Amino acid sequence: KKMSSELFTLTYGALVTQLCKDYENDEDVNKQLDRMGYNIGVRLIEDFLARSNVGRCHDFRETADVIAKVAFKMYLGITPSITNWSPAGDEFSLILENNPLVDFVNHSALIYSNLLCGVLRGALEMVQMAVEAKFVQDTLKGDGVTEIRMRFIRRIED
Amino acid sequence: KKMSSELFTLTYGALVTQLCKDYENDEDVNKQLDRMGYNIGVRLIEDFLARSNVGRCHDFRETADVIAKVAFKMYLGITPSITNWSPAGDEFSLILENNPLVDFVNHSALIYSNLLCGVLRGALEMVQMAVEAKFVQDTLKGDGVTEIRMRFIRRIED
C-alpha cells in the first residue's frame, strides 16, 4: 500500500500536540518522541530487511547510502543528500531541503521531527550498529536546510 | 510524496499507546481519537478538494463513491467497498477486508482505528454535510470484515 504523506503528517501533528499537553516541557517531548521513534525503528527494520537486498552487512558508508537512497524513499517518499563526512568516516549528515514530517508548517526548544532520530537509532541497533542521530539544523527554526547528523559509535557484539 | 504505509501505521500505534497511558479508560481514548480525527479531517479536506475534480457538490451517493474510490486510495492506499445502502439512501457502509491503520496486528472497548471516524466527519462537515461515522465491525475484534457505517444527518446551512 502506497499512500500520500498528508494523513501521516497530520497524524504525527496530532501526536506532537498530544505530547505537548502531556508534558508542558519541550525537552521532555523531545525525549518521548525519540523513545517512541526508537520503538518504531526496532520494528521498522524487519520490514525493511525483508524488502531490500542488503543482507547481513554492518558497513557505515553503505548504511548511509541505503538510509538515504532506499529507506527514506520507501518510508517517507523523499531522498536526502548525504554530505559532510568526517575525515575519520564515522559521521555524516542527511540534508533535506524542508522538514520531512511537516507538509503544512512558544516552543523554541521543541525538535518537532525528533521521532526520526529514534527511528534511525532503533533500526540501526537491530543490525548491531550503535549510532547517534541528532538534528543540527531545522528549516522550522529558520535554518537553510534540515540536517540530521549521524555518528557511528560502535559495533554491538550481542 | 508517496510512501509506504509502514511508518504511518507504527506512528499511529505510538499515538494510541500514548493515549492509553494518558487515559486508562478506553471509551476516553475512543473519544480523543475521534476528536483528533475531526481536527485532521477539517484540514485534510482542503488538500483533497485541491487534488480532485468534485467541485462544489453535496450529494451523498456521490460522496460515498468519492470517499471509497478516490480518498481512501489517495490517503491510505486502499479501496473499500460501498454496500448495505438503506432504503432511504441516507446510510451506507464502507467494508474493508482488514483494518486499515493496522499493518502489524485487555482493551476490549478500544476502537483502535477510531481516528478515521473523526476524519470522515470533520472532512464532510467542511463541505456542509453533517454525517455520523462509526465502526460496526472490526477484524481486530474477530469480525469477518471491518465496517464503517456512515449516516447522513443533514445539510449544514452555514
What element of type H or E holds A91?
A: strand A91-96
Subunit contact A44:B77, Cβ cutoff 8 A: no
* d(C-alpha B66, C-alpha B70), whole Å: 5
How far does A138 lie from chain B, in Å, by closest CA?
20
Domains and CATH numbers, chain A: 1-158 (3.30.1380.20)
Q: Establish if A44 touches chain B: CB-CB under 8 angstroms.
A: yes
Method used to determine the 3D structure: X-ray
* d(C-alpha A30, C-alpha A137), whole Å: 15
Q: Give the DSSP letter string of B41-103.
A: HHHHHHHHHHTSS--S---HHHHHHHIIIIIHHHHHS---EEE---TTSSEEEEEESS-TT-S
Resolution (A): 2.0
Q: Establish if A77 touches chain B: CB-CB under 8 angstroms.
A: yes
Q: Which residues contact B106 (CB under 8 A, 6 or more apart)?
A: none
* d(C-alpha A46, C-alpha A60), whole Å: 19
The bridge status of strand B129-137 relative to strand B146-155 is antiparallel
Q: Are B133 and B60 in contact (CB under 8 A)?
A: no
Q: Residue A33, CB half-sphere, CA atoms under 13 Å: how many?
A: 28
* d(C-alpha B119, C-alpha A13), whole Å: 14
The three cell numbers locating residue A118: 529514534
- What is the number of other CB atoms lying within 10 angstroms of the CB of residue A42? 17
Subunit contact B74:A5, Cβ cutoff 8 A: no
Q: Which of A2, A3, A34 to mutate to test the interface with B (most CBs of B within 10 A)?
A: A3
- Say which of A18, A36, A44 has its CB closest to residue B6: A44
* Cα torsion angle, B10, A63, A137, A25, sign: positive
Burial (Cβ within 10 Å: 0-12, 13-18, ≥19) of residue A126: middle
- Say which of B2, B15, B18 has its CB closest to residue A4: B2
* d(C-alpha B59, C-alpha B141), whole Å: 33
Chain A residue numbers with beta carbons less than 8 Å from the beta carbon of B115 are: 11, 14
* d(C-alpha B95, C-alpha B144), whole Å: 10
Q: Establish if B105 touches chain A: CB-CB under 8 angstroms.
A: no
- Say which of B6, B14, B75 has its CB closest to residue A7: B75
Q: Which of A10, A40, A42 to mutate to test the interface with B (most CBs of B within 10 A)?
A: A10
Rg (CA), chain A: 15
What element of type H or E holds A152?
A: strand A146-155
* d(C-alpha B31, C-alpha A119), whole Å: 29
> Quick one: how far is CA B79 from the chain centroid?
12
DSSP 3-state of A130: strand
